[PDB]
Amino acid sequence: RKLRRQMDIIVSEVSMIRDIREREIRIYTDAGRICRPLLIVEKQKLLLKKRHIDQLKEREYNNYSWQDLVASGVVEYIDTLEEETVMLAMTPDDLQEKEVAYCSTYTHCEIHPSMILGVCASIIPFPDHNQSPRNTYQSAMGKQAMG
Amino acid sequence: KDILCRLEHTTLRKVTANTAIYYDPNPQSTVVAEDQEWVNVYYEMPDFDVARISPWLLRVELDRKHMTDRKLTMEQIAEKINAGFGDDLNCIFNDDNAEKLVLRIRIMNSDENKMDDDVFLRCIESNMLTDMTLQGIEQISKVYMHLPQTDNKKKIIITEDGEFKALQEWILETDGVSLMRVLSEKDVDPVRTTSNDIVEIFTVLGIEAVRKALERELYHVISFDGSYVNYRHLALLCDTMTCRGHLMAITRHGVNRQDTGPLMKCSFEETVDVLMEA
Amino acid sequence: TVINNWLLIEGHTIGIGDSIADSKTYQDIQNTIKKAKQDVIEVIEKAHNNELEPTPGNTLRQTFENQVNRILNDARDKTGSSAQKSLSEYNNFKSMVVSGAKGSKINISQVIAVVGQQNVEGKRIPFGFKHRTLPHFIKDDYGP
Amino acid sequence: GAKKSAIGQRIVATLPYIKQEVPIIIVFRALGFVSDRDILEHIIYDFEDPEMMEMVKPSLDEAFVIQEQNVALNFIGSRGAKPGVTKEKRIKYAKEVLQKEMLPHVGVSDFCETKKAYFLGYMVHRLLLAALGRRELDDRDHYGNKR
Amino acid sequence: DREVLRVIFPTGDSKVVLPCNLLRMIWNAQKIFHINPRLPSDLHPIKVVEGVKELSKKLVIVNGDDPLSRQAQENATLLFNIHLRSTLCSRRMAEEF
Amino acid sequence: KSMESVMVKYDATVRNSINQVVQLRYGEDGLAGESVEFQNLATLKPSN
Amino acid sequence: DDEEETYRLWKIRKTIMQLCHDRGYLVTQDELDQTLEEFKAQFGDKPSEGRPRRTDLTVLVAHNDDPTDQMFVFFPEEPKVGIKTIKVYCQRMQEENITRALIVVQQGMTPSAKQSLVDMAPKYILEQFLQQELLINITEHELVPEHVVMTKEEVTELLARYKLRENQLPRIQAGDPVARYFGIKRGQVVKIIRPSETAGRYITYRLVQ
Amino acid sequence: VGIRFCQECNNMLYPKEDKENRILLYACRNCDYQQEADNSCIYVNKITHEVDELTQIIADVSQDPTLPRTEDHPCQKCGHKEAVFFQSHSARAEDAMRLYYVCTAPHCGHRWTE
Ligand SMILES: [Zn+2]
Ligand SMILES: [Zn+2]
Q1: Domain H46-114 = CATH 2.20.25.10
Q2: Which domain of life is it from (chain E) (predicted)?
């Protein structure tokens, strides 16, 4: 994990999966693996700090970009196989904050839960207040609209 | 529940906990320590096995809860094995007082006095676990028992005053179809008992019973969601499916069984081939 | 024709105001859902401590799922009825349901009180992940 | 059957470019592992587990007759899609099939038989766990199994 | 007729689908002729008994004087005639209708 | 396909194209489905 | 089990008496209503290896219309009826000059014997009934409606009234469980009477074919 | 239950009986080799198979971050308050709701069920 987060020998898209029960470590480097970026959480804290946000705010005239977040080890890509071994927090402000100890071993956090949606479902306003089939119908209608 | 046991198919596998093919050369001295205590009780006056006995032994443990749940005791299991295998096997079983129920099996003495003395036990052990039947009716995997809370499954009788009273009776539904066997079973209503398999009804009761059963099956599916269809539509379909006296499938398998003109057969399918024959 | 022209005077609409409920009604719904979750937690504790006795015709897993589902099914009904009673005579959700024109009691309750249990093939959401429905839960989490 | 249900359930292998499957132990014999202990060492990694040992008993009996690597290779070659004219050519064809067609991702070099035996034993080991109920069956819908 | 209905409907479900709605027809008759339920009725009970008997003959589903036709005619309109006789009985015509 | 030709003939029987008798009277009562409607038998439920 | 075997044999006798009575043969009312205790008490011993022999259980009945006409019901003790056992029964019919005979079967009937019955079918009518079938009277099942075998005089009137051909009636297979119950051959017509929820009663006619 | 392998060709040893002495012998096939059997049981299968899950449980699971952890069940071996609990969730059980606990203290893989 350390090498991948430092991007030393292991590229970002390499997924390492440990099946603790089965005593197997599976490393996958081939193509075709679907992955998404997730914020790394250590000791119930985000590795993403205000300094990272400040640098991103001056994205231009600063040369700071998304790749520096990956290089800094603050965010990493997780594929579906690795996601089975990941303890994921939906939000930092609520899940890993001190409270009734539902879970104290979060390993990752969502950047935003709304990124689960695709292009056409991402224009629906308040899609969480609609019946799910109606969100599916709009994704179809949005591709037939005029503009 | 007693009637349920006589219907649900129970085999030795269901009631048996574990089985071990112990060598046990000398019956007097048993390899298993605890087994020795009660074995000697059956060996003071051995009968039909004094001449010879197979060196190999087969010890099977019977689950207590399953035996009581099925109302099965140590006796009929030994009788059933002996009855099924005749004199081929000699069965010795312990007493119910012991926390563990045991049943020692050995091959006949006459054969001892051709396939294999050791492998044959495995063939018997596997054969007895599944093929052998303790009590029940084959093809009926599971039987459920419940009291109906709906009038249709309830029993309705006319009282002395002439009113309709719906009694709460126990009704058993099975996961398999053996209508002839179940119907003949004692203490089983030979009138109301029925099946959802049209073929089973056809071969047991007849075409007219199928006509009525098909009505009820067709009505049940239609009325499941609360919808209603006029009876005359239900009757007409069930009449056309049984008009010719045998189960008339609406598929091309049963449609083709119908007798019609050459052009009608073309409309169904296989148009070109039919016309050549005509 | 006659009532389509009287409706020009009476008018009929539906809006956000019809989807709201009283703060007292919201409190009642919250209490029911809070208690229903606690009831499911107790059923989980009984199963975890091997204090749950399977019912006839069902295995332990089926018994637990039946007990959990009825608790959550009852909670949805209890909150659904509570939300319906809060509706006024003027509520337009109720007017369309009462006349039978469109919608039902379940639609009103879902809009106002609780959407309820989601089922796939007649059962609760399966553990598609390894003993998890989503990576955001702990393994073997049978809570609502 | 009388003896069918006595041995139990036996494991076969459907290798590419073979019309009909072959007993699993035969494939191990062809790969160069003759003795039962050597074959089982690649399948059962913990000999203290009686449950696993019993599952392979019927497979061993099925391939009891074949006791030499060349005999096993001829059996594999005999069932090849293009049976050899003579016994010697059958062995060469079977060797080529296992060399390249069988588990190619493990290797294609002439000295990769040991690696292919371990993975093939792992495939058998995984099958036994599924048969024994120790590991859950793989989900086709699980999207980390997809590419 | 009551005993026959019991055989036809052992479950005791009285709802049935029949051609003519007699309860509404009686209700229509009450309104058309301004029947006063409070006052005594001038309808002779025998006219009710005789009237239904004549009516039953007119409601023909299978026509024919032979025994085969008569039995089929009796069967075809059996359920309706039981309903007709019980609805248009003399007692009800004089008590409630 | 099977029921296309089933028809109420002029003798009031229900027959198919082959002219075989499917029902002696349509719906066993010789009535059409439009006019009938639900009613209650008054003498069935009550006591003696 | 020996104890339940007498109960089993009693059921077949009860069904046969009901079967014979339905066919029109003379069966006494008390004979039809024969309780299990009466069947056991009338004989009174252990059934198996005891007093009941399937040859002993054989019964003779006579048609009500024609007293001379009679039917034989033969129960074979062997699990499977053989050719010789069938040959024994046919000779028995010759001695009593009984055209119709009913044969019960315990577990199965020899495939060779099946063709033998057809060969002798014209001179003598023989029917084979499995013991399992007769354990229950299907005619008493709710699904099964009342079946009445129509006489040729009735059938002729039926066709004349409806101006029908025999081919235009609904059909019932001669192997139908109810058809075998009444022993009706091809060309016979069955009058089925069943309740109707639209009409109350409905009579159906099925040609045996 | 014990599986024995030949000492000459490392092949399976199968049970065999010598009528001369009437003693179980594990005789190698295609090896004319025999051994003195001692267990006296050649075959045993448990239909109920009440196999303890604790034996199957691996102590390494305590490192899984996706498992729940409870402080209310201290480890008996060492007294560590924290423990990781889970269900077997393995087929052939038919009822998998009881919790198995594994001590989270490193080097102490104690496993227990309540
Ligand atoms: Zn050896
Ligand atoms: Zn510890």
Answers
A1: yes
A2: Eukaryota
